[PDB]
Design a protein around this ligand. Structure first.
Ligand code: HEM
Ligand code: HEM
Lengths: 727, 727
């Protein structure tokens, strides 16, 4: 019609902009100049809209898209309206089956680059040269919930990366914890069914806080290690950018000389590790179920590209049996204290998709999609995975041609004798559809293995034993890893774990299941067990109190790399601050606050009791981002309150409650001049308290003190103080 | 191994039990004796489990379900493991496409029966005899969210009823507001795209509080009427039990003489009308996303069967053109003050399904599934709905044999000449698959229309007009119904409509969209318009302040049946109270509480700061349902604090906050003896305040106050008092 505003305000700028500054938009409109090979190769399917006639799928233009065709303007709809029928028909068939697991996820385009050639240890083309850039598509996710469940639930997160190499797609389909729950793939449906919503009533969505999960866990002690990790703050990450990623399984690197090295893949978050606290995460699933998704998208639109360092734990073939645990057991981790992570490369995510359904929804990642230079191992969990991803995608994606769906296509050439199938796009001209053939001179042809561009040959591992359905006795050890994890945690981390098991176990209706988990915890650590028992009104028996603790892991009593916070890796860029306005802000405070934040790449959100504008003491007009209720403290990392007419919000329940929720969830809080009248709301001494920045104005050290607090993430020392506080 | 507790406490008692008294279960195990003809007919596919051997789907017994088959215990998985491949295959193919709209839904079985024969106005066999029961299957849903989205979001609610009649399936597919947002089916996809997650980033889930929704609404004022209902407390019902249901369109009733009568369908909730408040509801999507689901399932397990009265608005054919709105326009309601709802029958939902997926997820409802005695009209929304339910179902349910899926099958005879199709169950023995045929003597045969048991014949409506794509000029009025709704609401209802609009519009990033919506509100009612503008920081212009209000609706200045609360309809049975224990409960207080609660059918949930048990003063051991934080005030209708050792909880942060939250959400609170010391936490009154029950002990009087309050649902008079509270 010509419905946009004449000021062109309906359209976000094609330049990096801070979160909330502009309406968010499709990747290619938001950042047209951010390219990569894969992004360029999708131009054949991108479709514009501006200046084009509205049409049917057959290209016939539509005159009236507001009405069905009827016999009289008040008459019956006619079957002949083919415009209405194609339109409703496409609408009626929009949905596809969501992923069996990892239905909820958020994705983005990016690129990867190795620091140096790894040719000595792997002939994988994407790792052979530091100037070799490989496009990537990454999808982060939760395990249990459907596609419409919440982001900040407690859960293990999925971390899958599609590498569009020159010698094939390589998918690294990992999680954000270094182990999995089960050992053998045959039990996946059992474990997954136990964690998913119970079969009679489909409750609860996106949560393990229910009977079947803990029932399973309590009868399968192999699960404890990963359960420890999910029960910790690892299970509620601050963002997909602030968690670690792992392949979990031991795989093989094969070099040109044919030598196999055992490898465990890792991703290190260059923004560091940071997690929410439980009450915040649970509230955030309600106030904004799309928090991670939104944050990922906005970090990319703001230029805060999520960056990760690919790392490798490398173990020589000769050291296979040198640990107390089996290298092929997925419920066991390789302590970095024993086997360090070697820095391999950097992955940068710098552009959102155009259409979520087309790119994110249909992305198909598979762990068996490896390339020459990599190989598998006999890890029994991995072994079954190679069966499952290929299988599930014939029904999710409607057929065997899911590789022709734009996001999934190789950027490298692909030729073979495979034909037909639903949705076939490629029109093969080869006179032959079989080999060996003479009619096309046998093309395309097999290709011998070699140092570069050769065919895929599996490493000749010796295989020996009888056909058996048997767990390896080396896998029958379930408690030392959980114990190692436990002892590597800070005290406040240990308390949060205790609190996760406690909350969780309290949602289990059948008491005996709770007791059974407590007994299992007593096999790991008595202090953990007791603390959780106590929260559940359970007493340990004299026998539980004497269970002998599991042995150290290869002599290790703790590995600080297992903690989120024991070793400071804080990084403020991309974090966000809430600024609580009033109707006459000391503009001097605001300029100081704002400039200091921007200097460190920390965003702000101007908040108030209504939308619109307020005018500072000097006449500066301040645009309001959202209300105290509309953009709660759960969505920010810190809260700053500038002086002015504090009496304007001093008695505002929402303004006060904002501070209480923020204080409760250990976020740094800064009160300027009269804003200190809010000290009484959170019971802050006259003298002060670590974690609360206060001054007569937002000058001098005020923002630096506040920014040092943001660097340590949360004010852990405040925990005991929050114990009470009614919020 | 891994067996049941010795004490049989793993399995629920098969009798009515209050919410949380026992683990919930499949309905046929929870209520084996609850039967109806449809329930019974599902018996061919019910599958037990106890005492049976674990097998593949081919019936082969499985010996070891813990392991894959491998060449040695540390070896690779073999391809010949068929047990493992069927098991994982089934698992990989579990998911089917969710419903395009209404993916989130909760269902149950029950029965329907007319109060009296309606044979004078319809020949429909299910309404012809008061002692003729019709088995039903009902599903309640939200519109926008995915199948894993949250229940208590702001949304219209779907209310679909599947009637298994002796003359065919009749599905009455309605919503909880008497109108829909749009006029013509052609605009369905446009509207549902505008409300669903935005296409580039697939945000936000289950919410209309985003730019596309308000943009669409601002450009199409026909939506305003249903938008009014959505922003009022009708958009957040307290349960599926406490909402109304409506078929929206005008359909027809055809009697045996052939007289057509215009009919609008209604359901009256016999538990009364009641809704949450926004903050409660939004917070509840985080604390318990499956709250309506759970509540329905528990009410049914408890014997608090959801009951609805089917009612009819009847308009003689000669009154078609007598209102000042077109009867065929679905953005218009028929005010009860003009055409009264006639009581027709009662529907009781008395049993949950066995398997959610099989029964709820595959259920297929269609507004075109009518039977003889009913018929359509030219409503242009309805007309397009006839095309779509049928079409979507072929992909959603994988083929044209969706009527053979157990929950969807008719209980009456079905015989025709349609053959084949994917997953065909029915093995047809008829020699003929066409008619007319001589080889089977033309069976099955056509049956003439007639008063009872006759074939379907459409009412012979006269059709006169040109083939046009045109909106009837009479559907061109968009403001007087919205105003009628506005003016018929209580003051606190009006405020909640204002706040809903203010909250939602504050989440619209592009400010001109806010503005255009406010301008549309100014066409409806200037008081309303200014209340929203004020909250958005917007100033109406002179022009806007001079928009003439729309006319009354046939002289109606207000209609009290449009409001949830003007006419009191309180019913406390099936509600639930939180009882905050301390560690030395005064058993006499508790005794009295429970007794009074029991006499009115109100359930209790005993809460404490830890799980397990507390012992009252007389040695009674009180098992704890959940902790203060574990089951927040959001989940209960009122709070009772008995005396005893109040010092145990007086300083508990979660206990104080429990009360503050409940207070803020206008729920009745009862404090006894030393519990009255919590009056300071909810910082108000000392002589007391309407809505806070208090006494030296919980007596008969004390409980009568509380039950009276609960019978009014919320403490509306406390509204002015909650916005200073920091909660
Ligand atoms: C170390 C253990 C595992 C890890 C780290 C893992 C990781 C993941 C991730 C990250 C995704 C989501 C991919 C996306 O974003 O599209 C996924 C999906 C999936 N996983 Fe795994 N998984 C593991 C074990 C298994 C096992 C044992 C099986 C079954 C044998 C399995 C079957 C599946 C299937 C069927 C999907 C859906 C994939 C699709 O539809 O494309 N996973 N897994
Ligand atoms: C007054 C207007 C409408 C009402 C009251 C309404 C109501 C409903 C309800 C309650 C459901 C959920 C059924 C269930 O629980 O399985 C549903 C589903 C659906 N609706 Fe409507 N709807 C309306 C308008 C429309 C229109 C105009 C269309 C398309 C022209 C449409 C297309 C659909 C589809 C495709 C489904 C999914 C059914 C399935 O997958 O089985 N609806 N509708």
């Amino acid at each position: 019609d010509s419905l946009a505003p004449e000021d062109g305000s309906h359209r976000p700028a094609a330049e990096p902009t801070p979160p909330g500054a502009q309406p968010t938009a499709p990747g290619s409109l938001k950042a047209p100049d951010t390219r990569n090979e894969k992004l360029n190769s999708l131009e054949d399917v991108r479709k514009g809209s501006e200046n084009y006639a509205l049409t049917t799928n057959q290209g016939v233009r539509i005159a009236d898209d507001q009405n069905s065709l009827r016999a009289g303007s008040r008459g019956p709809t006619l079957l002949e309206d083919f415009i209405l029928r194609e339109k409703i028909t496409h609408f009626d068939h929009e949905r596809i089956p969501e992923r069996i697991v990892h239905a909820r996820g958020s994705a983005a385009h990016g690129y990867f680059q190795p620091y140096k050639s790894l040719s000595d240890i792997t002939k994988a083309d994407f790792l052979s040269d530091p100037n070799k850039i490989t496009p990537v598509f990454v999808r982060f996710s939760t395990v249990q919930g459907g596609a419409g469940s919440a982001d900040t639930v407690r859960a293990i997160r999925g971390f899958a990366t599609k590498f569009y190499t020159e010698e094939g797609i390589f998918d690294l389909v990992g999680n954000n914890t270094p182990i999995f729950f089960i050992q053998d793939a045959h039990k996946f449906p059992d474990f997954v069914h136990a964690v998913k919503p119970e079969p009679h009533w489909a409750i609860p969505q996106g949560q393990s806080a229910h009977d079947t999960f803990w029932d399973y866990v309590s009868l399968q002690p192999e699960t404890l290690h990963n359960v420890m990790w999910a029960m910790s703050d690892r299970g509620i990450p601050r963002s997909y950018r602030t968690m670690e990623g792992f392949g979990i399984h031991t795989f093989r690197l094969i070099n040109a000389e044919g030598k196999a090295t055992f490898v465990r893949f890792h991703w290190k978050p260059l923004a560091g590790k940071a997690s929410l606290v439980w009450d915040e995460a649970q509230k955030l699933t309600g106030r904004d179920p799309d928090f991670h998704r939104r944050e990922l998208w906005e970090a990319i639109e703001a230029g805060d590209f999520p960056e990760y360092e690919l790392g490798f734990q490398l173990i020589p073939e000769e050291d296979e049996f040198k640990f107390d645990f089996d290298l092929l057991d997925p419920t066991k981790l390789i302590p970095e204290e024993l086997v360090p992570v070697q820095r391999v490369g950097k992955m940068v995510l710098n552009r959102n998709p155009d259409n979520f359904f087309a790119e994110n929804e249909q992305a198909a990642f598979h762990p068996g999609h490896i390339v020459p230079g990599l190989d598998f191992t006999n890890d029994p969990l991995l072994q079954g995975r190679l069966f499952s991803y290929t299988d599930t995608q014939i029904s999710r994606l409607g057929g065997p041609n899911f590789h022709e769906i734009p996001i999934n296509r190789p950027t490298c050439p692909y030729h073979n004798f495979q034909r037909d199938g639903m949705h076939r796009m490629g029109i093969d001209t080869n006179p032959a559809n079989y080999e060996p053939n003479s009619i096309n001179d046998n093309w395309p042809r097999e290709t011998p293995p070699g140092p570069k561009r050769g065919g895929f040959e599996s490493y000749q591992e010796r295989v020996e034993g009888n056909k058996v359905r048997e767990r390896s006795p080396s896998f029958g050890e379930y408690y030392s890893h959980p114990r190692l994890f436990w002892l590597s945690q800070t005290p406040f981390e240990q308390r949060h774990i205790v609190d996760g098991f406690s909350f969780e176990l309290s949602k289990v209706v059948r008491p005996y299941i709770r007791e059974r988990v407590v007994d299992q915890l007593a096999h790991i650590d008595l202090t953990l067990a007791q603390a959780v028992a106590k929260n559940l009104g359970i007493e340990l028996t004299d026998d539980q109190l004497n269970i002998t603790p599991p042995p150290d892991v290869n002599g290790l009593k703790k590995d600080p790399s297992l903690s989120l916070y024991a070793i400071p890796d804080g990084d403020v860029k991309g974090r966000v601050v809430a600024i609580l306005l009033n109707d006459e802000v000391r503009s001097a405070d605001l300029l100081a606050i704002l400039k200091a934040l921007k200097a460190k790449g920390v965003h702000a959100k101007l908040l108030y009791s209504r939308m619109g504008e307020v005018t500072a003491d000097d006449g500066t007009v301040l645009p309001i981002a959202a209300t105290f209720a509309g953009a709660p403290s759960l969505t920010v990392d810190a809260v700053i309150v500038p002086c002015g007419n504090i009496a304007d919000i001093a008695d505002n329940g929402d303004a006060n409650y904002y501070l209480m929720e923020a204080y409760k969830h250990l976020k740094p809080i800064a009160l300027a001049g009269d804003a200190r009248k809010f000290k009484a709301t959170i019971k802050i001494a006259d003298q002060g308290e670590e974690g609360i920045v206060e001054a007569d104005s937002a000058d001098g050290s005020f923002m630096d003190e506040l920014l040092t607090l943001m660097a340590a993430h949360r004010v852990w020392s405040r925990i005991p103080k929050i114990d009470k506080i009614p919020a």
